[PDB]
From a paper:
The proteasome plays an essential role in protein degradation and is critical to maintaining cellular protein homeostasis. The mammalian proteasome core particle, 20S, is a large, barrel-shaped protein complex composed of four stacked heptameric rings, including two inner β-rings flanked by two outer α-rings that are each formed by seven different α or β subunits.
Endogenous PA28 subunits are known to form two different heptameric complexes: a heteroheptamer composed of PA28α and PA28β subunits and a homoheptamer composed of PA28γ subunits. Previous crystallographic structural analysis of the mouse PA28αβ heteroheptamer found a stoichiometry of four α and three β subunits. The protein complex for this previous study was produced by heterologous coexpression of the two subunits, which form a 4α/3β assembly reportedly due to a more thermodynamically stable α–α interface compared to the β–β interface. On the other hand, the PA28 4α/3β assembly derived from heterologous coexpression showed only partial association with native 20S when assembled in vitro. Our attempts at studying the native stoichiometry of free PA28 by native mass spectrometry proved inconclusive, but the data do not discount the possibility that multiple configurations of PA28 may be present in the cell.
Residue numbers in the entry:
A (entry chain E): 2 to 240
B (entry chain A): 3 to 231
C (entry chain J): 1 to 197
D (entry chain B): 3 to 251
E (entry chain G): 7 to 245
F (entry chain F): 5 to 244
G (entry chain D): 1 to 241
H (entry chain C): 2 to 236
């Protein structure tokens, strides 16, 4: 049967696996894909937004935590809104207390600690949002992904979301080129990688793509529907 | 069915089963007998020990809550100590507030109220021990029993523990209201003798007496004399 | 600085109060009413530190009214007094003591007319006649001299008018108009304001 | 399937089963009877306990004096009763401290009944399994008898019996009680007659019953538990009166 | 059934099965501990099994010192055992602070035991599965040996055992006490070693046994050095 | 059988299965080894590279719990990072109140007690991480301590945690570590890490090595890349 | 071949194999139990319309209040459990007022939706506060107002997600009404056309024949404040249909 | 399956425990309210005397305050708690705003209390539905009804309790502006309607009227007898 061992985060399975945490991890797959890549001078997040209906506007997939840090959500939007608020307050706190932009890595550690507590204690469900966090700090451009499981990873590039393996595949092959890339080239590489996730009939449009760029001189900026047009125009056609 | 597991659930038929199950624990407990004579109350219980290795002086089934009140228990042993300590404490609180030794009836009401509290919440388990409380207040002997349910009854004589039903019958046949304690202590040892299932010895039985002087535990030598009869 | 006077009688209790509410020196209102009707036959007259007076009176009035709705029988005058005293006493120890001096007047069918006096410290005393305020010092003696436990209602309003005219002749503060009301088995009955023009 | 656990789940058909189950418990308890008479109100109970080795140290096992002007008899889980009686005694004393007058009888009942309703509404606690009859004199409504249920629903009854064979008693009371004509003496007799029928024992032991009467004498209520000699006389008078009717038959 | 599975529920025959299950855990460890009380000395001996050569032998011990003059041997789950030792050490100090004299051994067992009843009566926690035997010298009553079991029972014994071979060990000890000859320090230690050895059939070497002694002449609990253990072991073989 | 659902429960035979189930979690994780030699303690973790995309020198399984002590973890990483935080807090407190660097044996005990608490209550699951702590202080010496999900803490001359624990122990056993010096051990740890790694099942591994000892002046530190590189070469050559 | 076991649906705080958090999904289904409400946002203003669903002639029509004013600038049409809506409309009313007090300005429609959404998200037991409903809220609100960016209509769902919608229908006939809305909506339509179009769609979806009593219609044109068409005004527009 | 907890939502989004509490109201005694132009009349059936039971204690119709009166159908005990809590609020509003509570404010307060109970598991919904009748400051008569769910609606006339469906049908047909024209006519309409569902006659109906400024008056049994007679004669 094995229906048992899956009811709560507090029950270890006979083989060492906490099933609810794994089930939570599945939530990220349900969400629309997002791709994050880094260059020696800039970090970029690109997202494929989805719309309930033609009349409805596309959802926000990229959110600004701070001038130096921004996140893209894949998964339940609610968990993301809650985590983002925690992150924003933690960043605001550092500026008031130490007058320094919070090191991006430190923030991810804090998101991990908050995220882990639901996993070990009966009660709150594990957060089911998967987050890609991008920021430029003194150490440099940084791209980190956070699983619904609290584990976090530092990545040269990553795509989280539905059909994200295809994007990871493109990113791995063209990865070396990214480090020395110019900003236009880096966003262009990313837009192509998310294109792979899209169904063959669908095409990247100004409406479904959101680009967020943070860099030594650029505060995190989410280029949106009409401002993605410069980055999108240079792109070619589906392979 | 479902009613049996919960303590806050009345069974169809309005019986709180976990309490009934709790009383069953007391029944399995070692026999204890209490007789209220005119001059005193004798509490006695079997202290049968698994091995000669156990040191008898270490733990006592019959304990003194206050100078004039003493109790004996049948049921789960760890639980008795919790109740005894709360009882010793509840009495000292009476002394501080009213500067008079607590009337026995009052302590039994207070200890019982504690027992009822444990019954109400789902998290806790009902106490599994029943206590026989004996005291001399206002020149009058008193004997009371508090069951895990939280209910106190006043018995001229009663037996709790294994073979309680047979014990009570023997006592009803052998009980005279005018009995003096020296005769009564003999009656009690006979009541325990009915269900001992072993040669009674001074160590095997523990006996306590309450009178004007106050609760005292007969020491092993004294009981040996009473057993000699 | 505010005057409350009450005269109990064989079948009635007559209560009067000055109608002046004032700030430092300007007598902002000439028609303040210091009588609050707790019930059909109970009146609480309250004088005291500003704010505390209205706040304590309203709390007591509403609580007494809740009893009426909840139980269907109005509280007895004596019971209400004990209730107000408990509340004021409890507060006296607290960091928010209401500095209020009160006179409670009521008619109970079983126990007849009653007038109760409570000081800020919360002492309650049933009294044949009583007054609160600096004015009381001047007028309590006039009542003492002319009061008979058998005084008639007409005689009582007259005694009260005599008490008030002394305040006009000797009290430093100007209390020009007074409000007078009688509680009887019938209930609180307003009587014409005794006004010394 | 099972909509009868937890006390907080309405069953399809809107019935709170745990309260109903609690009411069943009162049925197992010893019969307690209260009759209201113009002169006084009486509570008579059957002391179910009859074990030979039990002592009557207390004023009464099942009649408790809540306050100077009121008394109660309890039927149901004894432990639950002890808690409620302690609470009733505190609720009354609190009214006296606040209003310096005796608690009106209905109010004491209404307040306990409210504690009883709460136990039903909140999830953790079991509904209290006791039903109790309150007798008292209040200035507002004179002599009053009130019966309470585990539900927290209370009522004013001229006469009622709670406990085993309650139905038989109410039927007997319904024919026998004469409204506006009862006197304590007649009522004590009605009580013995109803108690005799309800109790299984052929002869009321006179040690198997406890009868307590509340009367106002000299402006102060007196709650007195009739002593055994007084009850023995009542039983004899009933035995003779019934025998005389049989002898006539 | 379902009568087991929660400590609070009582069996239809009033047996509180979960507490009984805990006593089984002490045996699962596979180690036995024997304590014997002499006229002037109290000794606790336990089997020390080191599973791996890599483990440091010094770290593995079941003998702990609750206070300078009280020593305990805890048999059962290792983790639970350490937890109880800390509570005992805290309780022992708290007595000195509040009452000004070293806790009597009986009172330490009583406090530790009473803590166990709370676990037995409250729903969330599990009875700790360990049994602690305390050895101490009380000036008024001479040497003392007390055992507290997961139930909350706290009896004091002339001699006792805990573990897999407890029943056999008790029988051996019972025969030796019945033929009472009183026990000198050497005999008390010798009786303990012979008992553990006979029940286990081990024929022990100094490394496999840890022996702790309290004596009236030197009241402080001392864990005997391997050489000291060897001396007693050699004597037993010689005679 | 409902015995295994919670840690509060005890099985009829006396076993608390949920704790045992938690111990199986560590076996899912990759092997990590710590060896204590006379000079100091060297820890090594085989960190599988799941994807080329992940940055090197990240996803670290070796954490510094205080200036003088280092922690190597195996098992669910999230719990481990959280346990590391508990350890760091405990170390800070010992310094703040007692005014000196925490003795490692005490640190292990305090963290173990925290880990054990989770074992008793039913609200919280046992932690799924097994970790090793090591420190070198001139007074204390070199100490390696390993804490299981149960909360059992013991001091190990050499220790291994993770999927290949049994295999690694056999290799560690033939080392005569007590005599060996810290620099030599780093090569040896690598040899064992390489031997245990299964190339077929696990595509690739990056060895992360850390050490504390007289050489590090009692500060746990990541082995300098020159030393690590030399060791990785020694290991491949030995693998032959 | 039917596998209908479920067993992860009951109890929020449980993620189904496939990570679906079904209790929240079921709450979204509840809004379908509610009366249909349709909102069209046009440059001229945003119009909101709802079907009253009056059970008995004796019930007073005014009391049913499916369109309410959060503040002069923003109004809300709610479909779903009426009771949980009352709490959400209240958080919104307090938050608009709190913004005036703290910043002396009028909250944008989006911020007000974010504010009510934040309350809705709390159902997950996100906070430790005792006074938070455990169940996800069962109401969907369409919030329409004239702000700095001009007429805007945002739709909020029991999940707590909010999005701007040019036209949306929430309720029993939302599927199908939405389809019709897609065909009729053109960005250029004036409010007068939208009111007529929305009422045409409602007439089709509603079981009863449209009458002034059965419908509630409101508009928030930029100059005017939230306006509810009175029976006389409603009669004129319905007559045009 | 989805009916054991108030918090759980059924596939199809129905909260079953709240609906079940509404079933409880149906088991309760009938109550009818008619909003006359100058009088609001609230009438409730009385189950039976029981002969030995004093009737003063059992009162379905109660006055929350001077201008607001409430009648309930459902678990009796719950009603006593809600009625008491409403009374505290009426007095508390008077303390806070110095003004008498409007009928709707009391209805909203009573409703919120009930919703609060439905919102969290660990509390059972109050199984009472109430008809609150009151006259507002303008003097317009107002009748509102509340349900265990917490929904409040204003009804020109309504019946809650057992047989409510039958009486409400009778009221729908019978109610007209003409019927409410005379204060006696209004009392007659409620009596006639209750008669439809009451097994007995006037002996089993308790009825009360609140006039524009007068306090609630429970009509004496004799006054009821007169009204039933006029209705029976006209029949």
């Amino acid at each position: 049967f094995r229906n048992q061992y899956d009811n709560d985060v507090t029950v270890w399975s006979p083989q060492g696996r906490i099933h609810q945490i794994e089930y939570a991890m599945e939530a990220v797959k349900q969400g629309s894909a997002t791709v994050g890549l880094k260059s020696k001078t800039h970090a970029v997040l690109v997202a494929l937004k989805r719309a309930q209906s033609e009349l409805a506007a596309h959802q926000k997939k990229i959110l600004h935590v701070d001038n130096h840090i921004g996140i893209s959500i894949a998964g339940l939007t609610a968990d993301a809104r809650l985590l983002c608020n925690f992150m924003r307050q933690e960043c605001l706190d550092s500026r008031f207390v130490f007058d320094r932009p919070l090191p991006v890595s430190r923030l991810v550690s804090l998101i991990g600690s908050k995220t882990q507590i639901p996993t070990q204690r009966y009660g709150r469900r594990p957060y089911g949002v998967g987050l890609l966090i991008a920021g430029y700090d003194d150490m440099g451009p940084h791209i980190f992904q956070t699983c619904p499981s609290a584990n976090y990873f530092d990545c040269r590039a990553m795509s989280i979301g539905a059909r994200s393996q295809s994007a990871r595949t493109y990113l791995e092959r063209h990865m070396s080129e990214f480090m020395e890339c110019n900003l236009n080239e880096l966003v262009k590489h990313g837009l192509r990688a998310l294109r792979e996730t899209l169904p063959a009939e669908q095409d990247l449009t100004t409406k479904n793509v959101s680009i967020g760029i943070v860099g030594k001189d650029l505060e995190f900026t989410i280029y949106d529907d009409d401002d993605v047009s410069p980055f999108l125009e240079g792109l070619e056609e589906r392979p | 069915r479902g009613y049996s597991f919960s303590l806050t659930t009345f069974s169809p038929s309005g019986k709180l089963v976990q309490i009934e199950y709790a009383l069953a624990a007391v029944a399995g407990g070692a026999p204890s007998v209490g007789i209220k004579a005119a001059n005193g109350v004798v509490l006695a219980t079997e202290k049968k020990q698994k091995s000669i290795l156990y040191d008898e002086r270490s733990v006592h089934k019959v304990e003194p809550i206050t100078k004039h009140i003493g109790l004996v228990y049948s049921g789960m042993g760890p639980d008795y100590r919790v109740l005894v300590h709360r009882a010793r404490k509840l009495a000292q609180q009476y002394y501080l507030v009213y500067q008079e030794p607590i009337p026995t009836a009052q302590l039994v009401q207070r200890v019982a109220s504690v027992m009822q509290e444990y019954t109400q919440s789902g998290g806790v388990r009902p106490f599994g021990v029943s206590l026989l409380i004996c005291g001399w207040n206002e020149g009058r002997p008193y004997l009371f029993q508090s069951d895990p349910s939280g209910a106190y009854f006043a018995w001229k004589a009663t037996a709790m523990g294994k073979n309680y039903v047979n014990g009570k019958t023997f006592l009803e046949k052998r009980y005279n209201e005018d009995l003096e304690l020296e005769d009564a202590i003999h009656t009690a040892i006979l009541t325990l003798k009915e269900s001992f299932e072993g040669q009674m010895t001074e160590d095997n039985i523990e006996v306590g007496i309450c009178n004007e002087a106050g609760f005292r535990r007969l020491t092993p030598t004294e009981v040996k004399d009473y057993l000699a009869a | 600085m505010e005057y409350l006077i009450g005269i109990q009688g064989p079948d009635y209790v007559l209560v009067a109060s000055d109608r002046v509410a004032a700030s430092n020196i300007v007598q902002m209102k000439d028609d303040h009413d210091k009588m609050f009707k707790m019930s059909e036959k109970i009146l609480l007259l309250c004088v005291g530190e500003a704010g505390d007076t209205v706040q304590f009176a309203e709390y007591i009035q509403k609580n007494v009214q809740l009893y009426k709705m909840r139980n269907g029988y109005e509280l007895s005058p004596t019971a209400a007094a004990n209730f107000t005293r408990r509340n004021l006493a409890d507060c006296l120890r607290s960091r928010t003591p209401y500095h209020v001096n009160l006179l409670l007047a009521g008619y109970d069918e079983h126990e007849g007319p009653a007038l109760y006096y409570m000081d800020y410290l919360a002492a309650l005393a049933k009294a044949p006649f009583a007054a609160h305020g600096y004015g009381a010092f001047l007028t309590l003696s006039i009542l003492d001299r002319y009061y008979t436990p058998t005084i008639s209602r007409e005689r009582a309003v007259e005694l009260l008018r005599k008490c008030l005219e002394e305040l006009q002749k000797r009290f430093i503060l100007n209390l020009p108009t007074f409000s007078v009301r009688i509680i009887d088995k019938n209930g609180i009955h307003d009587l014409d304001n005794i006004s010394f023009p | 399937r099972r909509y009868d656990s937890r006390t907080t789940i309405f069953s399809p058909e809107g019935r709170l089963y745990q309260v109903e189950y609690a009411m069943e418990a009162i049925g197992h308890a010893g019969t307690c009877l209260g009759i209201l008479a113009n002169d006084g109100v009486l509570l008579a109970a059957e002391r179910r306990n009859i074990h030979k080795l039990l002592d009557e140290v207390f004023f009464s096992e099942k009649i408790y004096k809540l306050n100077e002007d009121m008394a109660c008899s309890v039927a149901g889980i004894t432990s639950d009763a002890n808690v409620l009686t302690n609470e009733l005694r505190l609720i009354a004393q609190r009214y006296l401290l606040q209003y310096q007058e005796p608690i009106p009888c209905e109010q004491l009942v209404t307040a306990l009944c409210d504690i009883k309703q709460a136990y039903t509404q909140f999830g953790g606690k079991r509904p209290f399994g006791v039903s109790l009859l309150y007798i008292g004199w209040d200035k507002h409504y004179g002599f009053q008898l009130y019966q309470s249920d585990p539900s927290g629903n209370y009522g004013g009854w001229k006469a009622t019996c709670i406990g085993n064979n309650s139905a038989a008693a109410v039927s007997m009371l319904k024919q026998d009680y004469k409204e506006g004509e009862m006197t304590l003496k007649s009522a004590l007799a009605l009580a013995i007659k109803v108690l005799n029928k309800t109790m299984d024992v052929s002869k009321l032991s006179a040690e198997k019953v406890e009868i307590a009467t509340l009367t106002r004498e000299n402006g102060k209520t007196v709650i007195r538990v009739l002593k055994q000699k007084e009850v023995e006389q009542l039983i004899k008078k009933h035995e003779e009166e019934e025998a005389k009717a049989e002898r006539e038959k | 059934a379902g009568f087991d599975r929660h400590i609070t529920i009582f069996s239809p025959e009033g047996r509180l099965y979960q507490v009984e299950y805990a006593f089984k855990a002490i045996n699962q460890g596979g180690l036995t501990s024997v304590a014997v009380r002499g006229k002037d000395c109290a000794v606790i001996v336990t089997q020390k099994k080191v599973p791996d050569k890599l483990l440091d032998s010094s770290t593995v011990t079941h003998l702990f010192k609750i206070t300078e003059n009280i020593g305990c041997v805890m048999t059962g789950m290792t983790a639970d055992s350490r937890s109880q030792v800390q509570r005992a050490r805290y309780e022992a100090a708290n007595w000195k602070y509040k009452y000004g004299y070293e806790i009597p051994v009986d009172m330490l067992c009583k406090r530790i035991a009473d803590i166990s009843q709370v676990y037995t009566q409250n729903a969330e926690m599990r009875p700790l599965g360990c049994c602690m035997i305390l050895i101490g010298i009380d000036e008024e009553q001479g040497p003392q040996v007390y055992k507290c079991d997961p139930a909350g029972y706290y009896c004091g014994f002339k001699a006792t055992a805990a573990g897999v071979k407890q029943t056999e060990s008790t029988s051996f000890l019972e025969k030796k006490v019945k033929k009472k000859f009183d026990w000198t320090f050497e005999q008390t230690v010798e009786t303990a070693i012979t008992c553990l050895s006979t029940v286990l059939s081990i024929d022990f070497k100094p490394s496999e046994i840890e022996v702790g002694v309290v004596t009236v002449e030197n009241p402080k609990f001392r864990i005997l050095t391997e050489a000291e253990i060897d001396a007693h072991l050699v004597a037993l073989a010689e005679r | 059988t409902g015995y295994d659902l919670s840690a509060s429960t005890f099985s009829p035979d006396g076993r608390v299965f949920q704790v045992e189930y938690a111990m199986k979690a560590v076996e899912n994780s990759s092997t990590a080894i710590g060896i204590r030699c006379k000079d100091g303690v060297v820890f090594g973790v085989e960190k599988l590279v799941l994807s080329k995309l992940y940055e090197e020198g990240s996803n670290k399984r070796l954490f510094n719990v205080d200036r003088h002590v280092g922690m190597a973890v195996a098992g669910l990483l999230a719990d481990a990072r959280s346990l590391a935080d508990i350890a760091r807090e405990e170390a800070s407190n010992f310094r703040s109140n007692f005014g000196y660097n925490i003795p490692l044996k005490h640190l292990a005990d305090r963290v173990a007690m925290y880990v054990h608490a989770y074992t008793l209550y039913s609200a919280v699951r046992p932690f799924g991480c097994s970790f090793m702590l090591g420190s070198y202080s001139v007074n204390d010496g070199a100490q390696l301590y390993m804490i299981d999900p149960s909360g059992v803490s013991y001091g190990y001359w050499g220790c291994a945690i993770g999927k290949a624990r049994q295999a690694a122990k056999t290799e560690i056993e033939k080392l005569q570590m007590k005599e060996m010096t810290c620099r030599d051990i780093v090569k040896e740890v690598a040899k064992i890490i390489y031997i245990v790694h299964d190339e077929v099942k696990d595509k690739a591994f990056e060895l992360e090595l850390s050490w504390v000892g007289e050489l590090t002046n009692g500060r746990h530190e990541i082995v300098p890349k020159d030393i690590r590189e030399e060791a990785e070469k020694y290991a491949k050559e030995s693998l032959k | 071949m039917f596998l209908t076991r479920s067993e992860y649906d009951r109890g929020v705080n449980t993620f189904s194999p496939e990570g679906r958090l079904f209790q929240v999904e079921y709450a979204i289904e509840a809004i379908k139990l509610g009366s249909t409400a349709i909102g069209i946002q046009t440059s001229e203003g945003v119009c909101l319309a709802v079907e009253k669903r009056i059970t008995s002639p004796l019930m007073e029509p005014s009391s049913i209040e499916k369109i309410v004013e959060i503040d002069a600038h923003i109004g809300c049409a709610m479909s779903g459990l009426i009771a949980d809506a009352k709490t959400l409309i209240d958080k919104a009313r307090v938050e608009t007022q709190n913004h005036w007090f703290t910043y002396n300005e009028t909250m944008t429609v989006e911020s007000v939706t974010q504010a009510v959404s934040n309350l809705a998200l709390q159902f997950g037991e996100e906070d430790a506060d005792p006074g938070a409903m455990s169940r996800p809220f069962g109401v969907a609100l369409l919030f329409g107002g004239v702000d700095e960016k001009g007429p805007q209509l945002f739709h909020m769902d029991p999940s707590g997600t909010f999005v701007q919608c040019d036209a949306r229908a929430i309720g029993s006939a939302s599927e199908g009404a939405q389809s019709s809305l897609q065909e009729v909506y053109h960005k250029s339509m004036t409010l007068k056309e939208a009111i007529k179009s929305s009422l045409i769609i409602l007439k089709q979806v509603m079981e009863e024949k449209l009458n002034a009593t059965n419908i509630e219609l409101a508009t928030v044109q930029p100059g005017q404040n939230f306006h509810m068409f009175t029976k006389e005004e409603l009669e004129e527009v319905i007559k045009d249909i | 399956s989805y009916d054991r907890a108030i918090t759980v939502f059924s596939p199809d989004g129905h909260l079953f425990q709240v609906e079940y509490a509404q079933e409880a109201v149906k088991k309760g005694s009938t109550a009818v309210g008619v909003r006359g132009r100058d009088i609001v009349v609230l009438g409730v059936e009385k189950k039976s005397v029981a002969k030995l039971q004093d009737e003063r204690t059992v009162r379905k119709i109660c006055a929350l305050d001077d201008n607001v009166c409430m009648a309930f159908a459902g678990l009796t005990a719950d009603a006593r708690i809600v009625i008491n809590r409403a009374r505290v609020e009426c007095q508390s509003h008077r303390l806070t705003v110095e003004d008498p509570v409007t009928v709707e404010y009391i209805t909203r307060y009573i409703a919120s209390l009930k919703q609060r109970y439905t919102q969290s598991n660990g509390r059972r919904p109050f199984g009472i539905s109430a008809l609150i009748v009151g006259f507002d400051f303008d003097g317009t008569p107002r009748l509102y009804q509340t349900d265990p769910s917490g929904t409040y609606h204003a009804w020109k006339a309504n019946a809650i309790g057992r047989g409510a469906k039958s009486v409400r049908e009778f009221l729908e047909k019978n109610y007209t502006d003409e019927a409410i024209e005379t204060d006696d006519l209004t009392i007659k309409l409620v009596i006639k309607a209750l008669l439809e569902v009451v097994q007995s006659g006037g002996k089993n109906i308790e009825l009360a009227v609140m006039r524009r400024d007068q306090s609630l008056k429970i009509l004496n049994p004799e006054e009821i007898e007169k009204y039933v007679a006029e209705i029976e004669k006209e029949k």
